[PDB]
A paper describes a structure:
A typical TCS is composed of a sensor histidine kinase (SK) and a cognate response regulator (RR), which are encoded by genes that are often clustered in the genome. Modulated by stimulating signals, an SK first performs an autokinase activity and phosphorylates a conserved histidine in its DHp domain. Here, we sought to determine the crystal structures of a [name] homologue, lpWalK from [name], which shares 60% sequence identity in the DHp and CA domains to our previous solved smVicK structure, in different conformations in the presence of ATP analogues or ADP. The catalytic region of lpWalK contains one DHp domain (amino acids 370–450) and one CA domain (amino acids 450–624).
We also determined the crystal structure of the catalytic region of lpWalK at 3.2 Å resolution in the absence of ATP/ADP. The CA domains reach out, causing the ATP-binding pocket to be positioned further away from the phosphorylat­able histidine His391 in the DHp domain; we therefore defined this structure as representing the open state of [name]. The structures of both CA domains are similar to that of its close homologue S. mutans VicK. It is also similar to that of B. subtilis [name]. The major differences were the positional shifts, by up to 4.6 Å, of the loops and α3. Indeed, a global alignment of lpWalK with the open chain of smVicK indicated an ∼4° rotation of the CA domain relative to the DHp. A dramatic rotation (∼46.1°) of the lpWalK CA domain was observed when it was aligned with T. maritima HK853 in the open state. The DHp domain is sandwiched between two CA domains. In the open [name] structure the DHp is completely symmetric, with two straight α1 helices, whereas in the closed [name] state it is asymmetric, as characterized by helical bending in one α1 but not the other. We observed that two straight α1 helices of the DHp domain from the open lpWalK were randomly bent by 16.7–26.8° during 50 ns of simulation, indicating that the bending is an intrinsic property of the α1 helices.
Residue numbers in the entry:
A (entry chain B): 386 to 479, 483 to 561, 572 to 610
B (entry chain A): 386 to 479, 483 to 561, 573 to 610
Amino acid sequence: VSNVSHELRTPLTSLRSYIEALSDGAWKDPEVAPGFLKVTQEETDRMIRMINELLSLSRMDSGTTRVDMELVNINEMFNYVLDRFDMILKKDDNYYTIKREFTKRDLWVEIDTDKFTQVLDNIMNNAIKYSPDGGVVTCRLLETHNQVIISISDQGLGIPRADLGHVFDRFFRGTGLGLAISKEVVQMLGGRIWVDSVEGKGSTFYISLPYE
Amino acid sequence: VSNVSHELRTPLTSLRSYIEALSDGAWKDPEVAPGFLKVTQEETDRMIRMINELLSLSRMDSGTTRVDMELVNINEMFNYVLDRFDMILKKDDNYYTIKREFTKRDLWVEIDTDKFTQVLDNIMNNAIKYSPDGGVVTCRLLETHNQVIISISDQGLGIPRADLGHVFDRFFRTGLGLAISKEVVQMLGGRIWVDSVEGKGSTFYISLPYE
């Protein structure tokens, strides 16, 4: 599409600029060279991600993806993920807190650990990105009906109620595929994923899993 | 589809390696840094081209590509392209010759100068790259029947007659230049094809409506 290849074109040409800058001499100058190099690094990793997600949406949707399913404890799992995010957030130069509300009963669900961790990641990420003033990101885990409900909420920028359903279609606004990922994955893990937001009260992404 | 994302994945991870190398300190060292940067440069430009080709087949497949058609002199045109290639080959640190045989009647055809230039380029490229022992790349331009015939030949590695037809199918060995040229020429209302004998050589033909 004019869309995808151009959305790949952008960081490429970006990279081209920084690289050109170094090549023409910037590499010799210590005031800019590490910095420019860092930008190049980031752009590259970004593109590898975009590529990989593109690929997973090629193999998952079209649709031959071996999904490694284990009976995992989501209490621990969610705590691991949130730990990693707390670690990235505490070494920042800006500012974010993680408000955990996990039920006191240990829950076990049939999920792919790696693919679900990539889910939780993508959603936490998109949350922090739609929360410009910072503050608290709220993460809940509790059961109902034999749904295990994970919910992740930000009190940042709202989300248009006119477009609330299409957040899960490909590239709806660090890559812009994380939602497509999580939706597809969760759907495959046999759960349901959706969003509820009031502009600009805040945003909340829901995940539901078959409990037993 | 996994193919495309793998052919994009490779130079990316390449880039990652070189970039990482520099970032960890290589930039401070003058013996490797210009060189590593040259690699990064090349890989990046490469990826941009691959993107563009992908995109041109995205607009061509869906036929959403306005092809800017002019009545051009292919004699001069081919001479321009071959001039550029002669400059590229003469400013090299390695070996290649351009054998021009252009008919002495000036021919004019309805073509998109730029897209046909990318054709001639892609094919000349496939010639120079597929000529491991080096030597001469042969470029002919002559009319027949009201065909304008361009032919470009290399005396390098042959091309298997068992798979000789699929050189123009998507991603047969950036790796899309052939798909480009084929599609473009078809769109310019001409015909494109290949004839090769391993390992005598390879020869790409282009035919255009002459009048």
